[PDB]
Amino acid sequence: HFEEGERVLAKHSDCFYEAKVLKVEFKDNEWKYFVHYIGWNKSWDEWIRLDCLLKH
């Protein structure tokens, strides 16, 4: 429900970080979104669920 490359807010731990969507994938009856956290290396890039995403 989010285009790739789209800038969003992604929740990691307690707060939301400004992020960018790198991949969108569907599997096992569910969406999962690979995001980059602006300010942080590829190291910190990770998959996350819809729950954790927020439209800018």
Numbering used by the authors: 51 to 106
What does the paper say about this structure?
MRG1 and MRG2 belong to the MRG protein family, with highly conserved members in fungi, plants, and animals. Members in this group have the same domain organization, with a chromodomain (chromatin organization modifier domain) near the N-terminus, and a MRG domain near the C-terminus. Firstly, via their chromodomain, MRG1/2 proteins act as readers that recognize methylated H3K4 and H3K36. In addition, MRG1/2 proteins bind to chromatin that contains tri-methylated H3K4 and H3K36 via their chromodomains, the bound MRG1/2 in turn stabilize the binding of CO and ultimately controls the activation of FT transcription.
To identify H3K36 methylation readers, we performed an in vitro peptide pull-down experiment using Arabidopsis nuclear extracts, and identified among proteins detected with mass spectrometry the Arabidopsis Morf Related Gene (MRG) group protein MRG2 as a binding protein of the histone H3 N-terminal tail methylated at lysine 36. To obtain the information regarding the specific MRG2 residues that are important for recognition of the histone marks H3K4me3 and H3K36me3, we determined the co-crystal structure of MRG2 and the methylated H3 peptides. The proteolyzed samples were analyzed using mass spectrometry (MS) analysis to determine the protein sequence, resulting in the identification of a region containing the chromodomain with residues 53–123 of MRG2 as suitable for crystallization. MRG2 complexes with the H3K4me3 and H3K36me3 peptides were obtained, but the complexes with the H3K27me3 and H3K9me3 peptides could not form crystals under the same conditions, consistent with the ITC results. However, the predicted alpha-helix located at the C-terminus is missing in the electron density map. For the complexes of the MRG2 chromodomain with the H3K4me3/H3K36me3 peptides, the recognition modes are almost the same; therefore, only the complex of the MRG2 chromodomain with H3K36me3 peptide is shown in Figure 7A. The tri-methylated lysine projects into the aromatic cage formed by the His62, Tyr67, Tyr87, Trp90, and Trp94 residues of the MRG2 chromodomain. The co-crystal structures clearly indicate that the chromodomain of MRG2 can directly bind to tri-methylated H3K4 and H3K36, and provide strong evidence that the aromatic cage of the MRG2 chromodomain and the associated residues are essential for the binding, the same as other chromodomain proteins. Consistent with the structure, the Tyr87Ala (Y87A) mutation in MRG2 disrupted its association with H3K4me3 and H3K36me3 peptides, supporting the idea that the hydrophobic pocket formed by the aromatic residues is essential for the binding, as with other chromodomain proteins.
